[PDB]
From a paper:
The [name] virus is a flavivirus transmitted by Culex mosquitoes and is closely related to other serious emerging viruses, including the dengue virus (DENV), the West Nile virus (WNV), and the Zika virus (ZIKV). C proteins have roles, including, but not limited to, nucleocapsid dissociation and assembly. The JEV [name] has a helix-rich structure and forms a stable homodimer similar to other flaviviruses.
Here, we present the JEV [name] structure at 1.98 Å resolution. Similarly, electron density for the first 25 residues from the JEV C protein N-terminus is not visible in our crystal structure due to cleavage during protein purification. The purified JEV [name], whose size was reduced to less than 15 kDa, was crystallized, and the solved structure has a visible electron density for residues 26–98. Each monomer of the JEV [name] is composed of four helices: α1 (amino acid 29–38), α2 (44–57), α3 (63–70), and the longest α4 (74–96), connected by short loops. The large hydrophobic patch on the monomer surface that mediates dimerization is concealed after protein dimerization and the rest of the surface is hydrophilic. The α1-α1’ helices of the JEV, WNV, and ZIKV are found on top of the α2-α2’ helices and protect the hydrophobic surface of α2-α2’, thereby forming a closed conformation. In this study, we crystallized the JEV capsid at pH 4.6, 5.6, and 6.2, each in similar crystal form with identical protein conformation.
Author numbering:
A (entry chain A), B (entry chain B): 26 to 98
Write the structure that this text describes.
């Protein structure tokens, strides 16, 4: 059976795991235009607006950092 | 056997698929602080700097729009 991150990601696609990880995997689907699973969308809709804002704005700062690192390769 | 997005994501964790999708899933690992697979890191190291800059800056604009939609719930 699956172990490590592959197990973690499979579980997220079945609706299980931390709220921050749900929100992150939703951003992946937004960037790719792929179809999220029903269980993941279920988790996403139930997240409190204030909780969603906090994690997503933190993702944007981290994406900025990543872009700076790439620019300096 | 796996079908739909689960098959797409499994293949990406084995290093297979479009460069935009590799870059997207790398951002998922950055946001979560989870460990990427060796096969995924291999694809990421091989991406041309200009190609990486283009997709990652487009992700940042899409994340902004997503934050806007959450603010307006």
């Amino acid at each position: 059976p699956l172990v490590g991150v592959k197990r973690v990601v499979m579980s997220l696609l079945d609706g299980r795991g931390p709220v921050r990880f749900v929100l992150a995997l939703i951003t992946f689907f937004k960037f790719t235009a792929l179809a999220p699973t029903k269980a993941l969308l279920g988790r996403w809709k139930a997240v409190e607006k204030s909780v969603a804002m906090k994690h997503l704005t933190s993702f944007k700062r981290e994406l900025g950092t990543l872009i700076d690192a790439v620019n300096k390769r």
